[PDB]
Amino acid sequence: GRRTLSQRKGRGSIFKSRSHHKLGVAQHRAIDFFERHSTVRGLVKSIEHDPGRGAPLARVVFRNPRQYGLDKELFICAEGLYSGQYIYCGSKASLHIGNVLPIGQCPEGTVVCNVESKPGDRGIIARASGNYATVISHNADNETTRIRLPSGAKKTLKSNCRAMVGIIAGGGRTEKPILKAGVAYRMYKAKRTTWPRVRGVAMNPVDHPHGGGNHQHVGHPTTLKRSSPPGQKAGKVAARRTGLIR
Amino acid sequence: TGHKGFSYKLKLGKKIHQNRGVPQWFRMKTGNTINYNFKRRHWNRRKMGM
Amino acid sequence: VFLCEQKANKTMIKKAVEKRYGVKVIKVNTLVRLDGLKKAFVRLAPDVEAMEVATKIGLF
Amino acid sequence: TKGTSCRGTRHNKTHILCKRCGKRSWHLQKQRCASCGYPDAKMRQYAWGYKALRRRTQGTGRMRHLKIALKR
Amino acid sequence: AVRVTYVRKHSYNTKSNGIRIVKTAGGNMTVQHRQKISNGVRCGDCGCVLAGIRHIRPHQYGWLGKSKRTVTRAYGGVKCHKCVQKKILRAFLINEHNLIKLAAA
RNA sequence: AAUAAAAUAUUACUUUGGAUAGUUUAGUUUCCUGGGCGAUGAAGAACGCAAUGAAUUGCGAUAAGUGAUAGGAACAAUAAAAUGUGAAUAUCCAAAAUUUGAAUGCUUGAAAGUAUACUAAGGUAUAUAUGAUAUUCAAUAUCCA
RNA sequence: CUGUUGCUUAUAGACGAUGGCAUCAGAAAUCGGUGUUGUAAGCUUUAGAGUUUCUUAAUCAAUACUCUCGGGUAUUGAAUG
RNA sequence: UUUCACUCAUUUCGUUAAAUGUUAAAAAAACAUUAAAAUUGAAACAGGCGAUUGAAAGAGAUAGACGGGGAGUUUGGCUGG
RNA sequence: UGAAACUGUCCUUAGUGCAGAUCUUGGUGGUAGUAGCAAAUACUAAGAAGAGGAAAAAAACAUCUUAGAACUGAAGAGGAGAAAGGUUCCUAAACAACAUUACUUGGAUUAGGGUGAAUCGAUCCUAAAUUACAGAUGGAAAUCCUUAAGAAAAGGAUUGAAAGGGAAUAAGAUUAAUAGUUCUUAAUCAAGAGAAAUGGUAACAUAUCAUGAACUUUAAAAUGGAGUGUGAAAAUCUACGGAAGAGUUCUCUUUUCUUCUUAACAAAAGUAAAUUCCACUGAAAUGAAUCAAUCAGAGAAGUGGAAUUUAUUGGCUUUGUAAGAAAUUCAAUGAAUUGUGGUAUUUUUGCAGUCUUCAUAAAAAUUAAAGGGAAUCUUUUGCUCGUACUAAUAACCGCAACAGGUCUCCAAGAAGCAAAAUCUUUAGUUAAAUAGAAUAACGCAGGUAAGGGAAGUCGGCAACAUAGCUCUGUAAGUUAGCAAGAAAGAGUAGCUCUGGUGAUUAUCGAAUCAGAACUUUAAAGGUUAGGGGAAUCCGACUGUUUAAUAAAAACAUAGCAUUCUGAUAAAUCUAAAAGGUUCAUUACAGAAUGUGAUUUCUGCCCAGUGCUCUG
RNA sequence: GAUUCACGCAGUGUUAACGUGCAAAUUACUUGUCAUAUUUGAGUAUAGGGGCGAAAGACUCAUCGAACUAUCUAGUAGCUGG
């Protein structure tokens, strides 16, 4: 048959990201001595709206500690930040909302966000709206600490991985029911080309494996092995279970 | 168009220059068969495609 | 009004007219014709009369 | 409306005159010549296009210098 | 009524293609090319439009007299009068507190 | 029963058409000799040049032709001028050879342009990879005061 | 004799045909008869709900009265002269 | 052979490769640069730019499974059609 | 007839014999002077030019001028551009061919002429994107990478917009044709040449003034949409006073119509609207204000100031330019005039707040300011390229002068809610595949009809019927929002009057509403202009769909549910790849599926085939 | 992502006109729709067992249940015509 819609998605055609009005890459600043063995102070100049993402972005401004000028950064807002607030980033920073601390200095039970999976990689985990990761325990024997990811999974990271103390702003975004197809159309203004999704059973046998006959149905089980080739991998993949959960 | 490049305009002028018939004196030469220019065209008949 | 080579600009034509006819030129406008030639409108200085240059050249 | 009506908007050139072969085969968006294969250093010739070889090749032009050399 | 025509070769109602129809001798109407509406300067901190500076194109500020493109004050073209009073108080008060708290407490 | 307007048939002449016959400055095949392009800019493309040229032919700002050497009295559709103190015509020679094109200072869409150095305008050189030589440098890479 | 032709011909008619008259021919007005509609335009015309300006006379006014059984049309496929 | 420890190939990363290692000595939306003074001021060295993984994972060869995502092909004959 | 080659016999050789192949190519008949030359309302008289209206009406006659009658109706059949065309533009000679007759006409033949820029655009910058040296990959062609890998490029290469950004020009006149391009007059811009200031309490202000390097920062260029209010200009309409010309006039009409104008760039008599700040003062008995809002002890209201915006200086009147131009008349080049207003409509251009987003609605070239304190008026020049014309019921794309298609700017009167239908003024045109006579059938387009009223038919298909506005009145059902313009009834014309709604301090002004006598042909209906009700099925809705026989119950949809994935991952493109996409991302995320709003509810089955297992 | 009219646009019906047409899909009336899931110009990106698809096997230059063009190729034909 044809190449299904999932195959056509990996080619980088019209399915490219609609990132033209985006503000930029949101991350911590690059690690240095003044962050490893001191604290640098940042000023939250403004809080802006980055298209395509649900959380506001803070236009933080630091001072260059080795040369003359400014280090205009772009952080992800923690809930409660306000314009003109001072935020301190470093190993000796105080445990306040918005401060950037290595994950080893946070007491067990601290709620953090924008955590680095690897030291110095400028933020990976807990970046969506209203999300956060909790610190579970420390292990000074091998300099590793345990955190609980927003998916519930537990992850062990190095004790010098940085994080922002608090909650990502914009929580409760997905609790408001979209009511109209027009509203969902505007949701993907700064996203990829995915929205109007035709059911595979409404397709033809050439287009999709579900492309059916005289009655709209599937015909074969929709739970498939992980090793299925691209093209026939349509439906539920490696499904340990199905049906409504109890 | 009203707007054209310099090289394109010169190729327009040459197509104008080549749209002429045989001069009468050339038609009086001995053993002459060239009476009409069969490469001729007119704006409303054939488009020169350039 | 003259006809000049296309590869000549307005500055060359002004100097060429002054050298060829020993006059003064204050303004030159050029348009390139379809065939390829460059029509040049050379306006002489007020104290120079173009009627005498025409008969000297041979236009009349 | 796939016939007469659809041909109303055909006022945007795809190919313009090429610079190496002189034909209207320079694709504007593709930035290549479909006939002489411009940008490409080698002239575009294919063994299945045997007629297109005899339409433009050695000896189909002026031979300004080669005619002196071969006679020499 | 006399109807007019575009004088330049632009034929679309673009932002830079603004025109004005004015009357002339004999009742004829001519077409002028009008100028876009610009914004002024804003305080570097509070983002308020500064007073005393015109709202013209960036290049026209060069034609203006030296005194007409700024305000005679500290920072005088980048900060409002309120924006500067805060700057002076912050500098003096914090240095004074840094003088008494530390530096021979 | 009658008419020959139409219709039909034969021959002569004329007409529309270009078969047939006569003919060939064109092809096809085989064989012999060579198989002689280009950064000293090729093949190709574009533009321009005749006293009257649109195509074609020849040519390149020295333009349907210049010099030289052979050559011996023409060309012609119409005029002119030149011409045995040398017209036509011929050429593996000399000078000259526009814009491009491997295209090569940078850019090129149908793009008009433009930087530096040397000898205002003109003309040269400056792409990439590469061999030898010369010169200036880099790295404690190995020693070393 | 017959046909064409004329009456922009009819008792006929797609075209032919057919029928009638062809200088006592024909055609046209006007004119009377016969029909259709509904009472023309004018005015110093008498009713006019009211209004205005003079100072009580003008003027404006849908409609309505007399002249007016008016005016207009009437073979074009109507009938006389 | 299995379990260990390391890094040195190898992987994945980050920066203007901007203090690595070892010795030594939350009141304030503001400013901070082109140094005075006597080579210091502004300490030294490592043969590691800083982390991460690490002899495992990747790409290769051979072998087993799976693989209509895809390629090639076949789907006998008689016959009151 | 034809005018230069050919023939008979014997062997040899073959591209060697045609009625067919829907045979190939070329030519030609009957049909046949037949079908047609019928959308876009339409032409007529006199004259001129021409061979080209003659004639027993041969009933028709192309072009040009005048007169009559007309159409497009100012979202145009008007005046101009982008693309596309390419000389079709203007003029002259000429009509063999072409524009389904003809043509003296032509976008057709022949020969000439025509496109003028320091200020308009291209050129300059960057957007989506595009392409190089070196590097990486590939058996190869070549691919990847676009600043990461580089001894390359203070920081990152090329291209990419005649609609984005952008230094600077206008009025009149002129040509057979070009004009923000020529001429006259009047301007502007860029690049050049000849121990360092005052004033104001403050917001802030000063014909250059009044020094300001490296380095850093800020702002501009540079930012959605809707709706309401309003400032100013123009057009239309209108009030007062006129000047000039024109039309009507045996019936009147102090009458009806036209003209009465002004540029770029600058000046500062006079005088506005809105917003934001500054000084004095300190609000409660809370005040201030808008159509709406909205605001105040982090300071309202008041009084006095400062600033910015309002199509160039500084918004409007006014002034210079500048009346010497231009318009309307008059005389035969020369003469006359060129006031002041509107609590009216529309358009344009700004301003102020309000609403809305799981949408927040570009970058650079380039410019200015600031922090810091290093150092001690005249004149010249402004190069290259485009510029003619159509832009469409005849110049573009459809074989064409094709009823199809193709992006824009300017936009008068009537009437009306209306840029609707209908009529008209400025401009354009009367020709746009030929006409004349007769007035048969059958047609295509538009109509009417006695009595009955769907009996016709698969089926009220087609047509008929309702139709504007005001007032009264309005059910079942319901997601409580709707149904609903439900249904249903009444009124409406002309003329003469009356009253309500304001501003300025008696004068002035607006269309809107209500009411009363009288009259008649008893009044929305010229044009425009809903048929209504009772149920059943499907889809919840707005939306999309088989270009050219299916527009739907099909697709989408919001909602519901399930599966995998902690990023060195999941899905997935590539032959390979420091390769690519979601991803400028990080579980409120990414990817893969089924059902299809809301309400109510989703029962039992793990045997079979799948999937999975922490085994 | 309320109800309607207009400039426009589409194509519900007449299964009207035309059907060797004005037109290789158009015309007239009727109907629907006529700004936010709106309409539209230019630039740009996606290409053949590929693309693109609010899904009709629809569209990809009058060509699509696999485009166009050239070579293999005078492809093979137990079948039809001469």
TrEMBL record, chain B:
Any one GO cellular component localisation term in the record: cytosolic large ribosomal subunit
InterPro entries the record matches: Ribosomal_eL39, Ribosomal_eL39_dom_sf
One Pfam family this sequence matches: Ribosomal_L39
The name this protein goes by in its record: Ribosomal protein L39, putative
Annotated keywords: Ribonucleoprotein, Ribosomal protein
Matching Gene3D superfamilies: Ribosomal protein L39e (1.10.1620.10)
Similarity comment: Belongs to the eukaryotic ribosomal protein eL39 family.
Species assigned in the record: Entamoeba histolytica (strain ATCC 30459 / HM-1:IMSS / ABRM)
GO-annotated molecular function: structural constituent of ribosome
Source taxonomy: Eukaryota, Amoebozoa, Evosea, Archamoebae, Mastigamoebida
A single BP term in Gene Ontology: translation
UniProtKB/TrEMBL annotation, chain C:
Similarity-based family: Belongs to the universal ribosomal protein uL23 family.
GO biological process: translation
UniProt-recorded name of the protein: Ribosomal protein L23A, putative
GO molecular-function terms, A-Z: rRNA binding; structural constituent of ribosome
Signal peptide region: none
Keyword terms, alphabetized: Ribonucleoprotein, Ribosomal protein, RNA-binding, rRNA-binding
Residues of the full protein shown: 62 to 121 of 121
GO cellular component terms, semicolon-separated: cytosolic large ribosomal subunit
Lineage: Eukaryota, Amoebozoa, Evosea, Archamoebae, Mastigamoebida
From TrEMBL, chain D:
Keyword Zinc-finger appears in the UniProt entry: yes
One cellular-component annotation, GO: cytosolic large ribosomal subunit
BP term (GO), one: translation
SUPFAM superfamilies listed in its UniProt record: Zn-binding ribosomal proteins (SSF57829)
Classification via Pfam families: Ribosomal_L37e
GO molecular function, one term: zinc ion binding
This protein's UniProt keywords: Metal-binding, Ribonucleoprotein, Ribosomal protein, RNA-binding, rRNA-binding, Zinc, Zinc-finger
UniProt similarity note: Belongs to the eukaryotic ribosomal protein eL37 family.
Record-given protein name: 60S ribosomal protein L37-A, putative
Organism: Entamoeba histolytica (strain ATCC 30459 / HM-1:IMSS / ABRM)
Organism ancestry: Eukaryota, Amoebozoa, Evosea, Archamoebae, Mastigamoebida
From TrEMBL, chain E:
Signal peptide: none
Record's keyword terms, sorted: Ribonucleoprotein, Ribosomal protein
GO cellular component: cytosolic large ribosomal subunit
MF term (GO), any: structural constituent of ribosome
Ribosomal protein in keyword set: yes
Single GO BP term: ribosome biogenesis
Coiled-coil annotated spans: none
Stated family: Belongs to the eukaryotic ribosomal protein eL34 family.
Protein name per Swiss-Prot or TrEMBL: 60S ribosomal protein L34, putative
